[PDB]
Structure formats: structure tokens, C-alpha cells
Amino acid sequence: FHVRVTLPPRKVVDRWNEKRAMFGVYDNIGILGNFEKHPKELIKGPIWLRGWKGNELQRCIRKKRMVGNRMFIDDLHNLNKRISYLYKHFNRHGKYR
Amino acid sequence: LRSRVTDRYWRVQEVLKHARHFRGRKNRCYRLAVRAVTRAF
């Protein structure tokens, strides 16, 4: 519980930088653009999460189905173990059943 | 997002301020002070 004895430097963050000014600018690209591109294409990140949502088990299954063949050995083994554990916990464990 | 408690000092002090006149380790140790303070109240 020993708290620091000196005030930290004040983080001088600007709310009018390039990212904070351009954030979410093209979210209505379809609505205002004679529909040609969904807001899905604007999602930047992993290949298996570009415009998708799910729980941990579904995410793991989807990741294994798309990029499972390009994974490393240890991460693939960990993914298989995690898939098995999530399956068992979600189907055989719980209170509401 | 790792979240940790920073006001634990004040959380402990809010209980320890009512046990400063006790005898023994009850006035210093927090584990022994909460029980003593509750019985005092």
C-alpha cells in the first residue's frame, strides 16, 4: 500500500491530434456512398476478426479454422488445449445448465 | 487492462484510525484490527 512520494509528470495529451481528429470519419461510408463497401472493410486487425464477434470458444475455433495451418507448433498445441478446455467447461460445467 | 488498487493506504487507515487506543497488536495489525473495531462498534 506504499504509494509513491512524488507527483508523476502530467501527461500532456492533445485531443486534437490526427487520430483523435480523423477517428471514425468513414463509419458512414456505405450510408453516404451509394453502397459499395460495408464498414466491415474498415476494421483493421487480425484476419479472423475482420468484422466478426463471438465468445472465447468461437474465437478459438474460428482462429484454428482460418489461420490454424500457418500457426507455430506450440501456439497450435496451446490453441487445441484451450479449445478442448473451453468445450468441456461450456458443455459440462455451469449452474443454470 | 490490469487494474490495481492504489488507495489501499486510505482504506486501511479508515479502519486503523478507530483502533489506535487499543492494547497489543490490535492497534497495529490490520487483520487483528477489523475484528476488534467491529466488536467495539
Binding site: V3, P8 | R4, T6, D7
Partner: peptide, 26 residues
């Protein structure tokens, strides 16, 4: 290293209080 300013500023208040208790001003 705990990320926060409220705890540091509150401890600065407490440090000022302890300084006041130790050396009282005229």
C-alpha cells in the same frame, strides 16, 4: 509502478499534513 495521479496527489496532501504536524508554522 502504479499508473495514477489521484493517489500521488492525495499522498501529497498527507505529506503536507505530516509536515504541518511536525513543524508548526508561526
Amino acid at each position: 509502478a502504479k499508473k495514477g495521479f489521484r493517489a500521488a496527489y492525495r499522498f501529497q496532501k498527507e505529506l503536507e499534513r505530516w509536515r504541518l504536524l511536525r513543524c508548526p508554522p508561526p
